[PDB]
Amino acid sequence: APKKRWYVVQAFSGFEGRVATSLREHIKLHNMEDLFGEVMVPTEEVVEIRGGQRRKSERKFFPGYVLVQMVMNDASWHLVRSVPRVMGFIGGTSDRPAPISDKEVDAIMNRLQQVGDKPRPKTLFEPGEMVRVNDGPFADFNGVVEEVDYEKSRLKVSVSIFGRATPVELDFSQVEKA
């Protein structure tokens, strides 16, 4: 009853995807699916409709690394080191890697449930920063966000109208810097 643990291997700067591909391909090559459970590359999908990048954006939990459900053995070890573009086994001493803890797996998977559940636009806003308005009704004016909302997403923002400052309910789509 060989329980395949979870290990992590260093990928390269901009190679992670094709690395995971080639990994599964070499698994199929040696038919060692029993030894290699799943190659996990967690990611994130931050969604903004305008502001350059539009309607989506793809982040990752952490670059340069790939997560595998391998089982520990020298054969599997070289099977992962006989791949195009990886570094050694991220962990303890080389040729004797350190499987990541189960708590790590559980926490990361809770992270994945959270991120995949709600498409959460990052580059968020903080109550107290000043910001302009690129929208028709208040073109190029500038006030301070007095409250940030996410579901309603309507930027309670104090701005100067008729002398007295007053809140305004303009949406994210028209905010300036910050």
Partner: protein
């Protein structure tokens, strides 16, 4: 008798072969991953490194 000269020709073909082994590795891996018989023997190589 122990020190041979080496012209521009041999050195040039040597640099050729050296720049060639890397595209050899690359085309080997691209032939490995990619579809075996769906292509024309015209793009699996990248002559830019050569």
């Amino acid at each position: 008798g122990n020190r041979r000269i080496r012209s521009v020709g041999e050195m040039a073909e040597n640099q050729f072969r050296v720049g060639l082994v890397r595209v050899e590795r690359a085309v080997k891996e691209r032939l490995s991953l990619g579809d075996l018989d769906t292509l024309m023997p015209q793009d699996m190589i990248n002559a830019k490194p050569i």
